[PDB]
Structures are given as structure tokens and as C-alpha cells.
Design a protein around this ligand. Structure first.
Ligand SMILES: Nc1ncnc2c1ncn2[C@@H]1O[C@H](CSCC[C@H](N)C(=O)O)[C@@H](O)[C@H]1O
Ligand SMILES: Nc1ncnc2c1ncn2[C@@H]1O[C@H](CSCC[C@H](N)C(=O)O)[C@@H](O)[C@H]1O
Ligand SMILES: Nc1ncnc2c1ncn2[C@@H]1O[C@H](CSCC[C@H](N)C(=O)O)[C@@H](O)[C@H]1O
Ligand SMILES: Nc1ncnc2c1ncn2[C@@H]1O[C@H](CSCC[C@H](N)C(=O)O)[C@@H](O)[C@H]1O
Ligand SMILES: Nc1ncnc2c1ncn2[C@@H]1O[C@H](CSCC[C@H](N)C(=O)O)[C@@H](O)[C@H]1O
Ligand SMILES: Nc1ncnc2c1ncn2[C@@H]1O[C@H](CSCC[C@H](N)C(=O)O)[C@@H](O)[C@H]1O
Ligand SMILES: [Mg+2]
Ligand SMILES: [Mg+2]
Lengths: 244, 244, 244, 244, 244, 244
């Protein structure tokens, strides 16, 4: 597990070129949540499992004081490099999100790009509990998650990446095995291959809300970058608002 | 909605011939639950949304004192007819399960064949609350639910039924539109057709346990007629045990 | 052929409830075309193969002087009924679009909802030629077209419609056989069924442009209700602008 | 079973319009087999399970003396009617092919259009045994066989036929349940529907040969109207040649 | 051909980890067959095409005197290694099963895991003939057989295996081309790949029986580890019982 | 782009072994066109984008005086090598087909195997214009084109090729991204991989005829190696006849 965040860390931004191309639209939505859902001015944000800091840097660019936390130093290495290149001041920390000990010191806490799926029910409750403890009164928690083999390609410099994704689902226990073979091709034909194989957890929007309402005064479920939920939306946002 | 239980009531057992052919194995499992999970002797059972009483009669046949409740008299008419023909004594009552008012008088309450899907979150909570009140200490609540067009046929007397089912899912709001066209063919080619169109709710096993855990001391999740849950099971059983 | 416009005419608006629900967004786009693409003020519009007048009435409601033409009186009957009920003054005429003889008297000519598909190459050229002759200098022609069995349902009063669609394509000759079985169910189960079976022609956006550029000074291809064309758009609009 | 040959007999030729359009191509092949595989002159032919006599009539028209045998009078009625209309002399008899008692009476025995699928292993042996008895030395036995829901349509006069086929396969016992809903639509929308539900047997080319070799000194397997078998052929022909 | 048994021999047990996890369940069934179908005591067993001896070892472990025969030394090397490690006495021989010359020497002869698919009709007869010669009166012959691209993965120590299977079928000649790309990934990304490309033969339960009945006084067809055959079983077992 | 014609040039004929195995039938058709459609005797032929010269050599072998032109020297190297080995005299030239300047000097111009797809509308017009100039009166222009991942394999010497193809279509702009991963496996498992990634253009038969009709007196559309077009043909041939 975590092959994507260690050995493939330097290729993460390449693999997720699309996610980056639309980070601005996503943070526009996040700021609307800060403005309409939060019950306090949002200035300091804790971005959990920040990875290479794609949304982290976008938030920083807009004036937020951001602290990013990630389990893997290989990912943080990339985030710090980009922050330095863009003259953005962000505090990047290594650590497990389940072990944070911040106490009512962030106006908002975020977890971007389906990361709640890495946690089972017990760990998710632990996470939400720690997030609630990290928030200032009226602060908000924001996290997004989604509803044979597929092949695609990207390119980093002279290296071409051919990626093949497939999944194995176990509905009864709400588990999903996400597999991704990444082949890195050099100009002369030499190849290197790495296999991502992570166990993920499947949750419905209602499930997350039920688990979250236990830690936040109010929880909202939104879809498709709008502060509303439509029947056919395919990506969801859970917004937890701390009592003020 | 409810076309299947009103206009098509007399055709229900024909449409669900398969469900009937395996009711004995299902009740064998239910008795195992009464034995291993219930904390009191099970004698009096309340079967909610009993329909034509397929599992209701099988329980009665084994000596249980059963009370069956259903919203539609058309379904109850079939249940009573079969009970009479089989010399089984069962009290069949018409009524909404959400309006029951029984108090500490049933050793076990059941709801067979995916009927929880007819209730949204709010009504499901209301249902579980009333079920808990109806149960006696150590009593158990048992209910089962599942994980373009598909056509199949059955026959009742001289009439042949061609059934076409299809679904429309709204994932965001966890809603499912179950559509079923039932064509009834007579020997001379004359046809009568009826459209079933019910709005159903989509729940995961974890989700139901969460909503139920609030009303029962303990809640268990089982699969495929075994007091355990395997990764690939496709039919689930939720068992609520009243504190004893 | 044309079963949908004769025997099923009174059910057309029911079958296409969705098309109606979004006619306002479509005419908003049409007016943007009038404003930005036309080289003259648009007041009088000829709506060819107007059917039940869905977009025809919407245009009339907005102040345009509209003339609607359709081959089938059964469709016009519906259009006139709705126009009268809404106090909209529209001149509805019966006739073949390939036989129009209007001479430079319309500011714009429209053909809505994939109707160019009913015409093969030769007839399409004839149509475009007649449309060009009907337009005032700087006027515009606007028409939209799209890129096992599928079942769905609608309802008109007490009647329920179960619709099954399937197609048979002949790529070599760019022909498509559009088939639709419409079953009309009455409350007591009695049913009436009609089969739509029309031969349609398949065209690419570039094909239509090449055929249209021969009759209009300038032709534009737009997609998805925007005066631009994106790689993945699935519905197209051809806009022909007459020399001014 | 047999609904297609009784209640739907008068619609058989309509449903199998294509099977008819290429009957000449098929008989050309059959004659090639008489000429190259038969070790005697073929004059008198016994066409088993002749149905509406589609190939039976084509043979007679070419000078062959043919006797057609079928279990259903409803099918023979159509065959005789066509034989009469085309002034072709053919002896059409009603009877079960498993009960024939002919002996050294025919130069060739045929069974067209996948009918062997109606007989299980035991009955197929009985049939082959009877066919061998009916043949004259050097005579030949010829029969063809192939390797949802799917909806299609046809038309007979003013009546339109909408046909929906689907199958249920039992691989272990090599059984196939072929279902076909035939809806007959009148111009005014009135409908008549019949359900075809036959149990068929699945055989591979190898199987048939192994079963036939026991009764014919020589058994050949051909495909796609050629006296050869290619790896990807999808329609097979078994030819049994009686010892001369 | 045979790439899986030569170049990939040391990876066979990894690729077929599941086939191994249920070897005990399979031998339980095999013993049931020895006990109920064999007309003599089974002590000495000949396991044809034994491979890495997965079932061979399970039999020996239960007291049977087993002789394993395989064409490839690379596979036997693995079997002997495991036999040694588990201190099991087994005589592993290299040789072609089509060339065995045993006579009235074994109480039972086995061929596990679909290997009959490697032989065409002619060679399958030769094999069955040899097996019959090798058996003692009342002895039994047992063999199982079943009814893309698909990608899956496994792991042996630090090496990860990504396997991609696809097939090319020739229905007419009942041939199957089974292709499998096995990519072996080292932790540093280095890769080794081998392509499995075997020609296999397609047989139905009926076929095998017809071919076997010629050499065994009694031939039975079973499915899903039970001495019975159900309509939907997908894995079959052929049991040949020598005349006693 | 062009990876297939540069780095993989020496593997082209192996990858397209099938295309080669049927070149004779294709040239048989081409000669029929020279005979029935050309209005002059065909002796000198210009084969544009000749590649490794598969059809080029077949034409030369039949006595035609051929000039082959290709953008990539790597492909021409293979063509010249084969011509030399087969003692065929052909003039192979390097160059862009869009830059040809031949005038009234070829009896026929050809472009085999879907190469028109490499040109957008503008370049295709430019190409047809230059082809017309290169032809002599009554001369003919002939070109053929077709109507997740798919894996297959081939072999060149000791090297095995596993090829995985997939496509990404942009219907609105009629663009297609043809992707092909070619993995070259050596006996010891070592691998070399190359990614083909070309942008292609999608045209219908009618569309090509429209663009061509502008440069040739007559243009014909044929399908499946016959001087006619059938409804279900999947490969098309466009034939331009210069006015004679
Ligand atoms: N327990 C845990 N604690 C901290 N980070 C974790 C974690 N489990 C997973 N992660 C981190 O989850 C991240 C998922 S990738 C998503 C990255 C980033 N938020 C974005 O929007 O692009 C990885 O960087 C991984 O290292
Ligand atoms: N609110 C409600 N109260 C009581 N019955 C209800 C109900 N909503 C739906 N039902 C009943 O739900 C039943 C579903 S059919 C399943 C029937 C039966 N338990 C069996 O196992 O076969 C119908 O008989 C319907 O009338
Ligand atoms: N040759 C022709 N002349 C006039 N109308 C024609 C025609 N061929 C088809 N039609 C008409 O094409 C219409 C297609 S239905 C689309 C209707 C309408 N424009 C809308 O947007 O809803 C039918 O009303 C049919 O009668
Ligand atoms: N036991 C049996 N004896 C005689 N005919 C039989 C039969 N079982 C089925 N059939 C006949 O099988 C026929 C199959 S339909 C094929 C008909 C015809 N040979 C053709 O080529 O078109 C039906 O007409 C049916 O009545
Ligand atoms: N003609 C032949 N003679 C002996 N073994 C053969 C053979 N053709 C194929 N095989 C062997 O067939 C085996 C198939 S693999 C199945 C192995 C083993 N019986 C099990 O149950 O796991 C390979 O080990 C291969 O070497
Ligand atoms: N602009 C251009 N000018 C010349 N050749 C071109 C070209 N664009 C692509 N090609 C050539 O297109 C060829 C396509 S491969 C088809 C090759 C050959 N006609 C056959 O039938 O097998 C390649 O050899 C490539 O180099
Ligand atoms: Mg845990
Ligand atoms: Mg025409």
C-alpha cells in the first residue's frame, strides 16, 4: 500500500494533471463554503493528508495561513519544492492524521480528494473527533469523496507513463481494492513498473453524515461544486460546522 | 406506487415463485437467530409488511404464534386464504407499520424481503423506535435487504406473465426507481398490462446498523443465511437484540 | 414511418416532457445567436417541421412573429390548441419543408430537434437551398442535431406510457432505423400499442457544414448551448448566415 | 412449447423472412452435397420437421420428389397452401419424426434450420437410427445447426410484429430455454401477444459427429455453405453418408 | 506453449494460490469418489500431469501411495522440493502422459485442473485407452475441467506479479487460444515479462462422456464437488470406472 | 506521434502480419478498379505514404511501374530491403505527401491503409488538389479507410510482441487519439516498451466524397473489395476519376 505516495511520489502531479488543472474551480467552491457555512472568519487552515499540496498551495496563494500534514515525506518533499518555487509560505508537517493533537486552533480543516476512503468506520470516527477538537468555534471541516481495466497515459519530461487501473470490490464489507499498474517508459524503450494496491472503504453520503453529525453541531452534504445536492451528483462534499 | 400490492396482489406469489421455493431455508436461518441471538424464548412474532404471508405461514407452520401486519388488504386477502387452506392460525391485520403501538408484547419482530427500502432515513428511525417498544427484553428484530431491462416469465393457471424490470438510480440522494411492466397473456392472445413504479431507498449494511444501533442494545450484520458476514455476500440480515 | 406524428401526436408532449422542461434554456441560446450571429434585427421567424410547437410557442411568448410549418396536421392540431390556450398568435401551416416557396421574407429560419436527420444528402441540399431563399439579407438559419433496447415511462392523465427504444444502424450508407414501441396502459390493464419505425440519416458536424456552406455566406458549428464548440460536445448546432 | 408452430404458424414465414430470402443459396449447397457426398443419385427426398416447407418447396421446384413430415398441422397448412399456389407436387404428412418407419425408401433425408436442438441425446440417437433405416445405400442425411433481451420487428400485411427474445442457459446439462414474446399490433393499437417457450439442447459439432458416426459409415462436418469447415464458422452442417 | 510450466514454473504456486487454498476440499471429494464409485480399495494412485504436485501432495499426506507424472522437469522440481520439505514419499517421474505403459498397476488414475484441454479428440482417446490399461479392475479415472483482457495480481516474496489474460476462440474447431502476460516487478521497478500462449481444446460434459464411455464400463459426470450434476454447475468431474 | 514509423519501423510488418496476408486480395480489387473505373491504361503508379511498401511491392510484382513516397526513412529502409530481396524495381522517395509537385505524370495514385486519417479537412483538400495535378487524364486516385483496451500478440524472430490498443474519441471535432503500447519481450524476460500516440481524424464516406468531388470529375464510394457499397460494409474505398 501507499506505493503511489512513496516510490511514485515524484509522478503524482503528472498522473493527476487533470486534478491540478481544475484546482482553482474547487477552491472557489471551498471559499464559498467558508463564506456561507462557517460561523467565523476563515484565515488559518489545516489541510490533512495534503499530499503534494495541490489544493494546499492554491489556498495559500489566496492569502490563507495553511498548515499541511501528510504521512509520507516523499509527498511533502514535492509540496515544499513547489511552495518554495512559488514563494508561498506553508508549514508542512509529517504525521498521521489520526494522531493530530491540535486544540481549537484552526478556522477550517480540509481533507481533499477522497482520502476518507483510506479509513474504516472506527478510524473515520476517530478522525472526525480529532478534527472537531482542532477547530475554533464556528469553524468548518470540508472533505470530498466520490460516488475491467482502464488504460491511459501521461508524460513527465522525457518519460511516458502508461497507467492501467482496475478494481476488486467486496460489497458486503464495503471494501474496495484499488489497483494501478504504472509503467514508466524511457525514450530507448527501457521500462520501470510499479503496482499501486490500496485497500479502500466505501461510504454513502448518508453514512458519512451519520458518522459526522456525532462530532459537529451541523453537517451538510453538497455535490458538484454547489452548496446544494442534486439527485444525480457524482462527487460529494461533507461540511461539518463546529458549534459557535 | 404499490401497484404490485393492489392490482397485482393475486399475482404476487406467481411472480415470486422462486422466493417461495426457498422460504424453508430462510426460516431455518431465522430459527437459528432466535436460538443463538435472542435472549428469551421466541414464541410470539410480529411480521411487519407481511404481504401474502410467505414467511408468515412458514413460521406459523413451525408452531410460532404470529401476527402479520400489512398496509394493503389485497395482500392480506391472499395471506388469509392460504392460512385457511393450510389450517394455520394467524392474526392478519391491516395497517401502516409506521403507526404500530405495540408495547412489550412480542418476542421477535420481523420484516422480510427488502421492505426497509420503502422507508427513508427519518421513517426508518421511526420504524426502529416502534419496533424496539414492541419487543420484550432480549427480543430480536430481523430484517433482510439486498446489496437495461431484464425479462422473465411465470404462469398462473391459464395466464402467462411476462415481466420486464428496469431501474433508474439517483446515487446522490440514495433513491432508486424500481419499474416493472407485468403483461398478463391469456390463451387467445388478449393482454392486460400493469406498470409497477415504486420509489425505493438505498442503504448499505453499515448504514442500517448505524440507524438501528440507536434503538437496540446490540445490532448484528449477517449475510447469506449464516450468522456471519463474508466479503462477497449479496444479501444482508440486520439483527437487533433488545437489552435483556 | 411518422407514426409518432400521426397516431401518437396527442402523446408527443408527454413522451418529450423533458424536452419541454428545458425549452427556455434552448431559446435563450437561440436569442444569443440572433443577437451575435445575425446581421439584422430578428423579428419574424419561420419554424420548419414545428411539430407540436414546443420551441415555436416559446419564441412567440418572447415577442417574435412566428410562422410554423409541419407536414402533419395531427401535430399542428396540438400546436394550435396550446397557442390558443396561451393567447399566442402564431401562423401554423401544413406542408412539406422541401416545398416552401418563401422569398427573402424571414429574419430567421429554424428547424428544432434533430429533424435534418429525416433528409438524405440530396433532400438536405434542397432544404438548405430553400431556406437560403426564404431569408432576408443577414438573416440566420439555426438547426440542432445529435452526435440493446432502452425502456422508460411517462404518463398522460390516467394513461401510462411504457416506451421501448432500439436502433439498427447501417454505417456504410449512413442510415439509422429508429424504432420505438409505445404501449399505452389504461387503469384496468387494457393496452394499446404503436410502433414508430423511421429511417434516419447520420451526419457529422463537418458534413452538415460542408453541405451548408454551399448556400450561406458563413456557417458556424456550435455545441452544448454555447457559441463555441468543445471536443466532447454531444449535441450540435449549425448556424447559417445569409450574405448581407 | 411449440407456440411458434401452432398459435403463431401463420406468422412463421413473416418472422423468418430472412431465412426465406436465402433459401436458394442454401439449396444450392444442398445440391452440391448430393452431387459430391452422396454415393447414389438423389431423386426422392424426405424432409423431416418441414414446417411451412420453406426449403421443401425449393427442393420440389428443382425436380426432387419430396415428402415433408411435421408434427404440427398448423405448419403443414401453410406449406400445402404455398405448394398449391406455386403448383408444386409434394406429399406433406403429419407425424413425429421419432416414429418414422421408412426403410430403404429415400435417397436423402433432411432436417433444416436447427431442429436437432429439440431432441436430447437419447432421442437424437433414435432419430439418427431411424434416418439410417430410411436411407438407401449411398444415401445422405443432412441437417444444420448453429453455434438478451433482443427486440426486433416484422410485418405481415397491416399487422406489425414486435418480437422480444431472451434465453436462459443451463451449461451443465447443456439445456437452453428459448423465450420469445411476439406482440401483434393492429393499426388501431389493439394488441395480441403470445409467448414462445421451448426447451432446446446444446450440441457442438464434435458431439453431433460422435453421435452420428454410430449410424452412418461416414459423417462430415461443414460450415458456412461450403464443403469444408473453417475455424470461425458459426453455422454447421452434418452430413451422414450411408454405406454403399 | 508451456511457458507457464517452464520459464514460470517457480511462479506457478503463487499464480494459483487459490487453487491451493481449496485443495483439501477437492481431495475430500476425491476420497468420496474412491469410497462410493470405485469397485476396489484405492491405495496406489497415478496422478497424470501432476505439475507442482498440489493435489499430489494432499493425497500422499492422506496415506495414498502416489506416482506423479509430468512432461516438465521444471514443475517436478517444485513438487519434489515440497515433498521433501513436508517429508512426503512420492515417486515423481518425467514423461508424456500419452506414452505411459502401465498395466493393471493402479487403483486410480487422476488428472487434475483442466489438463484434458491440452489434448485434441484423437489424443484424448489415446489417453483414455492408456488410463484404462493402467487401471486394475474396479479402479477409477478422475479428471476435472471447466465450462478479456482481465488483469489481476499476486506476489511471491518481494516480487509482485501483474497478470493479464485474454482468449481467442475458434468455435467451429472447438479450439481456444489462451494468452497470459505475466509481468514480474522488482521493488526498484525493474521488470521481467513472459507470454503464455497455449492452444487448448473445448469439450462439453457430454463430449467427454461419449469419448470416455468407449474405454470405461461406467462413466459418470459430476459437478461442484458433489456426486451429482446440477443444471448450473460450472466445474465438471468425469469419473471412469473400470469393469470389476 | 509517428512512433510506429520510426522507433518501431522494423516491427511494422510483424505487427501487421494480417494486413500482409491479404494484400493479394486487395490488389486484385485495385486492378479491377484500374480496369473498370480508370479511363486510361494504368502503368505508372504513385503510392503515397507507402510505409514498408506492403501493397507497393505487390503492385510492382504485377508489372506496374511504381513510385513510393513516405515521410519516414525508417519505413522506406524496410521497403527498399524487401524490394531488393524480391528483385522488384521500385523508386522509393522520402517526402511529405502534402508537398508533392508531380504534374500530369501518373496513371494512378494510391494511399493505402487508412492514411487519410492523418490529415484534417484543410490538409485533405490540399492533398486531393495535388493528387489531381499529379494524375493524367482518365487517371484514378484510390484510398481506403475504416468505419477499453484490446490486447493481442505477434512475434519477430526470438522477440514476442504484446500489443495493447485503446482509443479516446472527441466526437465534436471528429478527432481520435489512437494509443498503442507495444511491449517487446526477449527470451530471458527482458522488456522494451514503446507508446504509439497519434492524433487521427474521423471521416464518413459521404464526407470524403464531398471533399474529393471538388477535385475529380467523378468520385465513387465502394466497400469490402467490391465495386459497390452495401449497407453493412465496414471498410471503404474512395475512387477519384480524373476527367478524360
Ligand atoms: N493516516 C494518514 N495520515 C496522513 N496522511 C495520510 C494518511 N493516509 C493517507 N494519507 C495521505 O493521503 C494522501 C492521498 S492523495 C490526495 C492528496 C492531496 N490532498 C490532493 O488533494 O491532491 C497521500 O498524500 C497519503 O500520504
Ligand atoms: N408502511 C407500510 N406498512 C405496512 N406494510 C407496508 C408498508 N409499505 C409497504 N408495505 C408492504 O410491503 C410489502 C412488501 S412485499 C414483501 C412481502 C412479505 N414480507 C414477503 O416476505 O413475501 C407489501 O405487502 C406492502 O403492502
Ligand atoms: N418533409 C417534412 N416537412 C414538414 N415537416 C416534416 C417533414 N418531415 C418531418 N417533419 C416533421 O418533423 C417533426 C419532427 S419532431 C420535432 C418537432 C419540433 N420542431 C420540436 O422541436 O419539438 C414532426 O412534427 C414531423 O411531422
Ligand atoms: N418430433 C417432431 N416431429 C416432427 N416435427 C417436429 C418435431 N419437433 C419439432 N418439429 C417441428 O420442427 C419444426 C422447426 S421449424 C423449422 C422448419 C423448416 N424445416 C425450415 O427449415 O424452415 C416445426 O415445424 C415443428 O413442428
Ligand atoms: N503430454 C503431457 N504429459 C504430461 N504432462 C503434461 C502434458 N501436457 C501438459 N502437461 C502438464 O500439464 C500440467 C497442467 S498444470 C495442472 C497441474 C496439476 N495437476 C494441478 O492440479 O495443479 C503442467 O504441469 C504440464 O507440464
Ligand atoms: N505527411 C505525410 N507524408 C508522407 N507519408 C506520411 C505522412 N503522414 C504519415 N505518413 C506515412 O503514413 C504511413 C501510414 S502506415 C500505412 C503504410 C502503407 N501504405 C500500407 O498500406 O501498409 C507511414 O509510413 C507514415 O510515415
Ligand atoms: Mg479497524
Ligand atoms: Mg434521395
Amino acid at each position: 500500500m501507499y506505493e503511489l505516495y512513496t516510490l511514485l511520489a515524484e509522478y503524482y502531479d503528472t498522473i493527476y494533471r487533470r486534478r491540478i488543472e481544475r484546482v482553482k474551480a474547487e477552491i472557489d467552491f471551498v471559499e464559498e463554503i467558508f463564506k456561507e457555512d462557517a460561523k467565523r472568519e476563515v484565515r488559518r487552515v489545516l489541510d490533512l493528508a495534503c499530499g503534494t499540496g495541490i489544493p494546499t498551495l492554491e489556498l495559500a496563494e489566496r492569502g490563507y495561513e495553511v498548515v499541511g500534514l501528510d504521512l509520507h515525506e516523499e509527498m511533502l518533499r514535492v509540496a515544499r519544492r513547489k511552495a518554495k518555487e512559488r514563494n508561498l509560505k506553508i508549514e508542512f508537517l509529517q504525521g498521521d492524521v489520526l494522531e493530530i493533537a491540535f486544540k481549537n486552533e484552526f478556522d477550517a480543516v480540509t481533507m481533499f480528494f477522497s482520502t476518507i476512503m483510506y479509513f474504516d468506520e472506527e478510524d473515520l470516527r476517530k478522525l472526525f473527533s480529532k478534527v472537531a477538537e482542532a477547530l475554533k468555534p464556528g469553524g468548518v471541516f470540508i472533505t470530498d469523496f466520490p460516488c475491467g481495466p482502464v488504460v491511459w497515459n501521461e508524460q513527465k519530461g522525457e518519460e511516458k507513463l502508461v497507467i492501467m487501473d482496475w478494481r476488486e470490490v467486496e460489497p458486503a464489507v464495503q471494501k474496495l481494492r484499488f489497483k494501478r499498474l504504472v509503467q514508466i517508459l524511457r525514450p530507448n524503450g527501457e521500462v520501470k513498473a510499479f503496482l499501486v494496491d490500496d485497500e479502500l472503504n466505501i461510504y454513502t453520503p448518508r453514512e458519512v453524515r451519520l458518522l459526522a453529525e456525532k462530532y459537529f453541531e451541523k453537517v451538510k452534504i453538497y455535490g458538484n461544486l454547489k452548496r446544494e445536492l442534486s439527485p444525480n451528483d457524482m462527487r460529494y462534499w461533507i461540511v461539518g460546522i463546529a458549534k459557535s
